[model samples]
Every structure is written in C-alpha cells, then in structure tokens.
Target chain A: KIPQATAKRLPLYYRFLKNLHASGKQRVSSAELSDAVKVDSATIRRDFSYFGALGKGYNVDYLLSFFRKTLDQDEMTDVILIGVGNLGTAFLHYNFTKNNNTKISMAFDINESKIGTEVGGVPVYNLDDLEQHVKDESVAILTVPAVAAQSITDRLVALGIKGILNFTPARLNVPEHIRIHHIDLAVELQSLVYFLKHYSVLEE
Target chain B: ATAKRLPLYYRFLKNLHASGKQRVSSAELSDAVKVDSATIRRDFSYFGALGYNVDYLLSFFRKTLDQDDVILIGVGNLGTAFLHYTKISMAFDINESKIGTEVGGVPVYNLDDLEQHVKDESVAILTVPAVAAQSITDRLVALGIKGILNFTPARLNVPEHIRIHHIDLAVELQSLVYFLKHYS
Candidate 1:
C-alpha cells in the first residue's frame, strides 16, 4: 500500500499533470513541479521515485498515464445524484466529467415535473424507483432538502451505497464501515465567520 | 430565562459596540435580537443586571464576530448567494457572459485577468468547478492569495503557508451515507 500521506498527494500531483499535458508541455522538472503544487522538490523527487522516476524530473505523458492507472481515472465510476434543486442543477450542468472518470448516471427527486426529464443529459428518476434503477453504484451525491436528507440517506444505506456526498445541513449517523462527508453550507459560512472573528492576526 | 437567547443578545451587543454604542437599553436589544424587552430584562437578571454594557457582555459571550472583505469566484448560484452577503472588491468567473456583468454591485471579471486585478487581497472564496478549482487556485497562489474558502469537493493541495477551508457539498452527504450503512 502507498503511504497514507503519499497516497493523499497523488491526486494533487495528477491534476497538475493534466494541466501540463493539455497545454502541450512534455517534461517538468521536480523543482518546477514543486513550485506549482507547493510540495517541496525533495518530496516530489521521493514520491516520483516510489512510483516511476524518469530521472531529471518526470515526463508529463508517462506520469499522467501512470497516475491515471493508479488513481482509477481510466475506469468509469457511475454515481447517483439525489435532489434536483438549484444546487443539484448546478452539479448536473457542471458535472465532473471534464476532470474525473465519474458520472452522475442518474438522479432522484420527488418533484413531479422533474421525474421524466433529463437535466444536463443525466436522467431524473422518481425517488420511488431508486432501488429498481440503482446498479453497482457505490457512491451517491445528495442535494436533497434538509427535511428529506436523513430518510433518503437511510434508503440509500439500505440500497448499499458505500459512500455519500451529503449537501444538506443534517447530521446523519451510519455504520462504521460506511463513509460520509458533510458539506453543510450554512455551517461552513458560520464557521468561516467564527474563524475570521475569533482567529485573526490582530486578535492577539 | 432561557440561556439560548444569550448568544443572540451577545452578538447584537457586539455589533452595537462596533458601531460605537457603549451602552444599550433592553428595548434596543429586544428590538435588534428580536426577544421581548421583558424577556430580555428577565434573561439579564440571570446576570444580576437590568441592561448591558456592549463591551461587558461581549466578554461574557466569549465570542464576537468581526468583519472582513472577500473576493468571490465562479458566479454560479452558490457564488451569487455569497455575493449578496457582503460587499467585496470584485468577483471572477470563466463564463464570458458573466464576465462583464455585476452581481450584488460587484463587477465580475474574466478569470484570465485574475492576476491583474488581484492586489492586496489575502483571501478568496472559491466556487469554481472541481476541474477548474486547482488551476484557479494555482493562479490565486501565484498572485499572492493567503487564504481560500474553497467550495469545491476536490481536496486541494496548497502550500503549508496558505489556508484553504473546504465546504464540499457532495462529500458531506456521501460520508453521511457511509455511516448509516456501517456504523448505525
């Protein structure tokens, strides 16, 4: 297994490489790579050597393909998106297709008007048919209202989603093996306000 | 008599303090924080006081929110919501249609001109797509941004010197699903 710290940095390195390749850059020095990602040149050299080093920096093409394989970028991962509100609409329109191998293969909403339509090319299915349509999708993106956040979560849990990206401000509890990441916008704003107010250079 | 209203009272008092109002009456506090004056008086009785010194209760609450200006990115629905919250230097976006427009009275600029406009701004609020997030971040860092309120789900990699806070909407819900499946 890759070191936990090194594994975490892999995507950061991979993203910049995509940028490099698109711009038609063929080679990058560890020093230049270091400057871009803010990871020190020494650590970049060490991490690349652990993967595959081309010596005197790394080839953008070679490392891009190598990182693509390691990060599973070559494989398509189907994802389920819940709720088609404004936030959900934003996701449908700005789906992560340009960056990752993941796609919002389907979405679920209770609104009658949205049920049969496709937003951003992804089908909007009735919330009732979630279990019927769900396949091997292990990940789900939730943009449901706070009132419906937990119940939909329970449904998804029973359906065997391994991971969830929750947008509501609801605090949800799940079993130990399951993974949940909360992105409560209201809380984020309050937390940022709290930090700015309480933790500042001038506070001392 | 509820302790729940104390924080609300505390916030209003601090705002009054910043406005140079040193002392406050129950009626004023009542009107601002929205509790009844009689209820406000009764709540303050818990502290053995009838009214409040803006400075004193600010200490009592142990927290007071200050103000800071910020620049916004993306100009999407989320970014537009943030723009309505505070007046800022400017906003940036990749959408050519939005580039020359103004949201909440702040002019939007083409993201390519970000480096040109960014000067003396230490913090940024990022609402760009996850794909554009890191590249935009790279530009911010090069232009001397010190902190970021990152709204993208992408876990950005920034230098040790920079402060990046994430508000990943999808990741939060996904993590919730994980726990219900395994932990509960």
Candidate 2:
C-alpha cells in the first residue's frame, strides 16, 4: 500500500485528471496538475513517482487508467444508502455512474412513502429488509438523522457493512476493523470559520 | 494549537457524551475518529491529559473551535439540508419561487440582493451548482466574504486572503470506495 498521505490524495488527483480527460487534454505537466489539485509540484512528482505512474508529461489517459485500477474503478462497486431524506435523496440523484463505477444498488428508509418508491431511479427498501437485501455490498452511505444514526449504524455493522460514508454530525462508534469517514457538514463549516479566525491562508 | 483536528475531536467527544460514555481512551477515539492515536495524545497533551472525561474534553475543544455564524447560498435539497445543519443568519437563491419563503425558520432572499444584506457576516456556505459556483464566489469575495464552505464540485480561484474549503460529495464517496479497495 502507498503512504496514507498519498493514498488520501489519490482521489483528488483522479477527479482533476478525469475532468482534464473529458476536456480532451492528452498529457499534463506536474505544474498544471499541481495547480489543479493545489498540491505543490514536488509532492505531485513524488506521489506519481512512488506509484511508477509518471511520464515526460503525465499522460491523462494513462494516469486515469492507472489510478482507476489503483482505486478499483475497473469494476462496479455496489453501495447501500441509508436514509432517503433530503441529503440521502441528493445522493441518490447523483448515482456516481457518470465518472465512477459505484452505484447505490439499494436504499433503506423507514418511511412508508419512500420505501417502495424509486427516488432518482434507485429503489428504496424498508429498513427491516436491509439484512435480506445486503449481499456482497460492504459500503454504506449513512444520511439518517442524528438520533437514528448510531442505532442504524449498529445494524449496518452487524449486517457486515465494512465501510461507511457517514454524513450525519453524529460521531459513530464502530469496531476498529470498519472504515468510516465523517463528512459532518456542521463541523466542516465551523472548522472553516475557526481556521479563518485563527490561522493564515498559507497555501494556494 | 492543532487547529484542524480540534473540530473532529470536539464533535466526536460530543457524540461520545450523547452515547452515554463518560470517559474514553485516545486509542478508542483514534479508531472512531480515524486520527492517529499518537496524534490524539499529542493534541490532548497540549492541554495536559491522556484518557479524557467526555464532557471535559468537549468544553476544551469547544474553546479551541471558537465558532462563528454563516450565510448559506442556494436553497436546493443539499442547500436546505445545510440550513437545518447550520444556524445561518440568512440564505440566498436565484429561484424566485423560493426567494420569499422561509426554510428552517431562516428567511430566503434573492441572489441579487446578496450585496445589500451581507452586512458583517464574513463566512458563506456555498451550495450553488458547479456552473454558478465560481460566479457566486466571485460576488461573495467582492462583497468581502472571508471564508467559504464550498459544497459544489467546482475548483474555485480566490485571492490569498480568502479561504475556500470544499466538501465535494462525489470525490468523498469515490475516495471511500478507493480506500475500501486498497486500504482495507
């Protein structure tokens, strides 16, 4: 595995490169990649070199292909989304198939109106049927209310979900083996305000 | 002071308290919040502690956070979701149908009126679409907004004094999927 720092940055680099590829850019220099992702040219050089994925000027198609496999983008990754409220609904509308191989295979919610209905073309299932329906899909996107977040996560964890993209403000407690990323909107906003207050904007 | 991780630790401690846990070890916190255990230890060490009482840590981290209010732009599903999450002084949108309404008790205003009402609020929660993200940001910066919490996928350009933090949900899920494949 690559260094965690480089691994975390791969997705950012991939997104920028995907846009470049769509725009018909064939090859890009480290300086241009650096400008796009805001990583310095040296760190970009190091990250690409570490993976043995660089060129005279990196080939956009090759880098996209390289990072795609590195990120397991070659195969479809099924995901289950819990909660179909505004945030969850917003996610279902996105579907991730345009630039990614991921899809919200099924969604779970307790609402009677939403359970059978297809929101953004993804079928919603009852929360009770979650165990029966969740097969090889190990990742879940949790967008439930704060009160419902943890208990539902307990169920997700028990049902063998391996990774979670937690959108709630609630900090979930799960086993060490499980990978969870919290995209707490509230905290992120406040963190931005706090940074602006206490720290300098030191980077581009 | 460790600025960035303070919010993560504070939010986690709040969750721990609500979950009825009175105290926690840094290692346990490391697993839950994904920060390094040693980093968590060092963060707490700045304030002098190791194993932490949940409530005590909450107060300390709250002090570190030193919070602020913000104005949210756009009232779409994602933007409205943010209204419930943030205590915004006001919200703005280009949709005339939504311009006069109230969401989560905060009044919505027309996007053109952004300059007249901005007042002293320096921070903005940008939930505009990708195409409009940069233009709205351009106006916000011209109106003296200091910090932006950008939800759109657009990579914005701003002066050295402005700070823009992106919460691109697509990139986030993509990265999580990547981690599941390789890191897991």
Candidate 3:
C-alpha cells in the first residue's frame, strides 16, 4: 500500500512536474510545488520521499529518465465537452484558458446550430463525430441534457474516459477509473436543507 | 451518509406529511428509500425515539429537526440553469430589475431578503460571483444557515459551524484532466 493518500497525490506531483517541465523550467523547489498544486511544501516533499523519486532534492526538479519516461510528450492535452446548454455555456466563459496542461479541444451537441460556434477556445462538433474523436483514453466535463447525459457517458466511458465532472443529478452506474465527482445542485441543496431543519440545535 | 441518504426521503416524507397522513411504519420508509426496515430502524434508533405517531414525527421535524425553504442567490447563467434544473422553491439575486419576477416558476427576490428568508429557511444555493462570495457567506453565517452549496469560482473562507460544498467546474475539469492523463 503506497498509502492511499499518497497514491492519490502521486498524479498531482506528476502533473505539476509536467507543467514545470513543459514551460522549459528545469528546476523546481518544494515551496514552488506547494504554491502550484496548493499542497504544503512538507507534504509534497514527503510524498516525493515516499515514492523514492526525486529530481536531485526533496523539491520538484527534472528527475532525468524517470521524468522523461513518465510524461507522454503530449504537451497539449485536450478535453471534449458534450451538451452546450446554458450550463455548458456557463462553463465556456471560464474554460481551459491557461497552460494548465488541459484545454477544451472539442464540443458536441444535438443542436446543429451549436456545432459551428466555439465555446471559449474549444471548437464545436456534431454529436455524430463523438466516437470519431473520443477513442482510446480519457476524461470529460459533461453538462448535457439529463436524457442524453447517461448514454453519452456510457459512450465516452467505453471509449476510455477515465474521469468525468458531472453537472447533472442523473445517477450514473460507473464501474472503473471511476474518478467521478458531481455538483448535483438538487441532491446537495436538499441534503443541506434536511440537515438544517433536522439539526437546528447544531446551528451556531 | 445518514444525512446524504436521508434527503432522498425528504420529498417522500413531505408528501407523506402533506397528505395529512399521521403515523408511518418503518416498512413504509423502507419502501420509500428501498433500504430494509430493520436497517432503517437501526439507523433511526440513533435519534432515540420514533414510532407509529406522525405527531411525534412532525414535532421531531418542527422542534427537534430543522429544514427550511431554499434561497437561491445569483440568477446568472449557472444560477438560472439551476433554477430551471433544480427543484427551487425560491430564488434571490441582486438584480433589482428582475425582482418579483420568476425564474423557472421559482419566485426571484432581492438578495437582501436572504437574511430574514434564510433564517426561517435552512439551505441556500449560492451561485453568485466571486467578489460577492465572501460577503454573501458572511450574511449566510449571520442568518445561521445550516448548509450552502456555493457555485462560485472562489474558495470561500467561512466560520467553523457553517458547512459549504464548492462546485467549481474549471477546477474539477482541470483536476479530472490531470487525472485522465496522469493515469493513462
């Protein structure tokens, strides 16, 4: 057991290292890593130490062969968006506008009119071409119509989507790489209300 | 887990309450949420007392428990979407122009009403802009709001007693993207 928490943080370390390596920067300190990933410098150093991996120090630097071998040279990682409804458009305004290693590369919608315009920088496409571009591996941020969200998810997951940030309350039966997080406004707000009304004594 | 799973039964319980029915067996609650009756009681026992009397149950809810109407702040794109999507009872926003108007059948009120409105009610769906996140949270805390679902981009700093859940699309999307590649 690589410590479940550390196992969880390994990828965060790796990704920051990628970003550091991408910008042509060769050296990174723990303090810098802390600021970047918002993790503490000591914990970052601890995870690095636990991994027995380093780029010459307890800080993040170029770890030579391991560094090169780990990162897939695919500098521009692109993600696709499905369902450009109001919520989807809301997501557009605050999109992958940075060099944070990911960009919304494509979008798909049933409404063909949406197929031409761009949201943020990501280009729009017909849902017909979904699998055409969605093959091999993955992640996506979905805000589609409830009816279409699940099947579309099923389609994407089979195409190797490893994770999803779902905006709808539709309960999904995901099985693997199930790094799924939801912001189901209804589910959560109701839960909060349930607590507030039930546990009024705890209200401080 | 109890709190999370219990919300699913709120509407059912509300319907049960509103239907003027008094008294429900654990079997009925079990049927409502699909958990076994024994399991439901095993969990309900933590509350100390529950029985065949809807009067006791209603009192438990009215006095012992807390629940309130929802107050939605910020009727922007995402907020407006939730007004249409989520089962909103009421909405609040700063736009005086839209005051008294309705978004998706949910009445929109001035943001100032959040204090008196939320004090009577228990939960709030906060979709306001980042600049207002902290201040709005300040009001929510003062009102003794039990929970908040904050949809703003800013990670707000609030008091210890107030529970908040942040819904940042960009952060989650980027984080997911990080995992997508990091794992693959």
Q: Highest lDDT, which number?
A: 2
Cα-based lDDT for every prediction? 0.76, 0.84, 0.71
Candidate 1, A19-56: lDDT as tens digits: 99999999988887888778898888777766664665
In angstroms and one decimal each, the interface RMSD of every candidate reads 5.9, 5.2, 4.8
TM-score for model 2? 0.63
- lDDT per residue (tens digit) for residues B1-184 in model 2: 3766886787677777878998899899999989988988888888666568787787776665554258999899899888776368899998999999999888999999999999878899888778899999999999899999888888999998788898876788778878877987
Give TM-score, chain B, model 2: 0.62
Q: For model 3, how does the per-residue alpha-carbon lDDT over A64-136 read when each residue is reduced to its tens digit?
A: 3454444433355656778888888777776444556666667888897898888776777888889887764
User: Comparing only chain A of model 1 with the true chain A, what is the TM-score?
Assistant: 0.61
Q: Which regions of candidate 1 are displaced past 4 Å?
A: A1-77, A93-102, A173-178, A196-204, B1-68, B77-90, B94-96, B99-122, B129-144, B152-159, B166-184
In candidate 3, list every pair of residues with a backbone clash.
Answer: A197-B65, A197-B66, A197-B67, A198-B65, A198-B66, B23-B54
Badly placed stretches (over 4 Å) of model 3 are: A1-76, A95-99, A135-137, A174-178, A198-204, B1-68, B112-119, B174-184
Chain B TM-score for each model? 0.58, 0.62, 0.62
RMSD vs true structure, all candidates: 15.5, 17.9, 13.9
Model 1 lDDT tens row, B87-122: 367999889999999898999999888878888676
Candidates in descending DockQ order: 3, 2, 1
- What are the runs in model 2 whose C-alpha is more than 4 Å off? A1-74, A95-97, A200-204, B1-69
In model 2, what is the error at residue A37, expressed in angstroms? Answer: 40
Model 2 Cα RMSD, 1 decimal: 17.9
Candidate 1, residue A11: how far the Cα is off, in Å: 28
